[PDB]
């Protein structure tokens with residue numbers, strides 16, 4: 199719908215019914231009580247994670263939390279090698295190849311990632327798990343990685359777009375704060391822009407990329423409003439960006455402007471309950487960490503493993519009752535607390 | 536007695552009889568049936584909880600579980616905010632993310648106190664705010680705060696439990712027994728838990744410490760530390776682990792290495808520990824009557840809402856448990872310890 203060379207999550211599942219069967223099976227295995235590993239391993243399995251560090255978004259740390267906890271509950275012996283990638287400056291600390299890991303948990307936002315993934319796929323025996331993407335790549339139809347896991351960007355963005363198009367009318371002005379340049383921005387961003395422009399006839403005033411930090415969100419917001427102060431809402435593509443943007447609106451005295459979150463972590467939820475963030479799409483966070491454990495389990499039991507898993511979203515607005523937020527938290531952080 | 540600047544738990548109550556009286560009272564109210572809130576409140580009280588997450592030890596989870604249920608049974612409206620703490624660096628992310636929840640303006644704040652990093656924050660909370668402060672998992676008041684003590688120190692006394700362990704090891708093992716120590720991460724816990732055991736066992740029983748290592752407070756770290764230790768000193772008769780996760784990592788390490796000769800303990804007696812005890816992989820432990828400290832916090836908060844004096848300190852009770860204890864004994868102990876957390 200927005201990028202060429204990918205399967206839609208649902209498109210994938212519709213094209214390959216077996217994959218729907220597996221992904222459903224995994225969904226159910228992710229919901230039900232832990233069923234421990236049925237095949238003792240001779241030694242620990244070496245699992246390596248590379249994740250973006252020091253984000254205000256708690257997605258990753260909660261993902262590892264819920265992952266490790268489900269691993270433990272499943273009675274799987276492992277060694278976890280975690281890498282904290284400082285907020286951008288190298289990436290050649292993808293030296294976790296030297297680790298000779300059994301499972302590699304990584305991301306795919308840029309091309310700098312693509313090249314490396316193709317390296318991991320065409321060279322090693324290491325099973326690759328791609329977090330925060332759920333739309334498989336067509337070029338890899340012959341050898342797809344072990345699993346794509348996350349909360350589908352297109353869907354979560356679609357739901358937001360829908361809510362905005364429901365609240366605001368035709369010819370509503372808005373600006374967009376992207377993530378850093380890459381896959382996330384393209385999907386999270388252009389999905390919203392296309393829906394809202396073509397279905398609801400809004401008028402995009404401007405759009406800017408950020409450095410994926412709160413500071414950058416703040417700066418970018420300010421610049422955007424300096425150039426186009428007359429918008430009805432800003433659409434942010436991520437937690438930190440949106441939370442910087444919130445400070446920008448606060449400093450500029452612009453309460454007229456609506457702003458969204460994206461993901462519904464703890465920070466966003468506090469902001470929403472404060473009224474600083476107006477709407478968000480909230481991912482049932484722990485499901486994906488728990489899904490990775492289960493996938494790994496089946497693999498060790500020589501059961502077939504789905505290629506894709508996507509977790510559920512819930513729209514959350516500042517008009518929600520604290521009861522609702524509490525229940526969603528109890529659902530979403532049932533492992534990471 | 537292994538650190539300076541701290542009041543002993545018994546010493547403190549020996550110093551202040553009214554303080555003992557209050558603590559005895561709290562114990563009584565803890566064991567007895569719920570006597571629900573007298574003076575009701577206009578609003579639901581805001582409580583901010585800062586706990587470490589992601590561990591095999593079920594102490595915190597069960598503490599919360601029991602706390603909320605005793606709160607319910609006392610009928611007190613409350614909102615309960617769990618601040619996610621990432622043991623992942625850095626000090627200045629933690630610090631700000633701790634400062635985040637003081638603009639939350641909570642009635643009560645539940646915290647830990649392990650690092651010097653925590654000290655500065657606690658001191659800030661105490662020096663500059665109205666928020667009533669409950670320090671979980673510490674039972675020895677800081678002498679430098681005699682001007683203005685926290686609302687409550689609550690937990691199970693590290694020195695007492697370590698002594699009990701030290702005594703059992705002292706009873707079983709002869710003089711000149713070689714042993715190694717796995718600490719928690721650096722801090723107050725490691726200091727008391729580790730050095731109380733080391734001092735008692737070295738000085739009273741003439742044991743010999745072969746080595747000692749800090750961990751990162753995780754099971755994997757306990758495993759790595761066990762391996763490293765036994766790599767450098769394979770000749771030890773037992774390892775003394777300073778926490779559940781560390782202990783359970785060490786257990787897997789001793790499994791992987793094939794050292795069934797080396798004895799090893801837990802520290803806390805949670806579910807994982809007990810299951811390991813009964814499996815025979817863990818040898819002895821000091822089990823705490825878990826839910827008492829959760830029920831205590833709940834009471835202290837009640838008494839406060841009724842404008843009654845609350846004791847500065849409360850320490851829950853301990854029971855030694857070995858793999859030679861019958862399932863019945865284990866079941867009685869579980870029955871007591873987990874009466875609320877199930």
Ligand SMILES: C[C@]12OC[C@H](O)[C@H]1O[B-](O)(O)O2
Nearest residue numbers: 255257330435436437460461
């Ligand atoms: C996972 C994530 O996607 C990009 C960034 O890593 C996170 O921020 B976010 O919370 O907006 O979702």
Ligand SMILES: C[C@]12OC[C@H](O)[C@H]1O[B-](O)(O)O2
Nearest residue numbers: 592594672777778779802803
């Ligand atoms: C509460 C606790 O003390 C330190 C650590 O936080 C927990 O693990 B434990 O089970 O050893 O008890």
Ligand SMILES: [Ca+2]
Nearest residue numbers: 537726729730
């Ligand atoms: Ca010492």
Ligand SMILES: [Mg+2]
Nearest residue numbers: 384387388391
């Ligand atoms: Mg575009």
Ligand SMILES: [Mg+2]
Nearest residue numbers: 452453454455
């Ligand atoms: Mg506003």
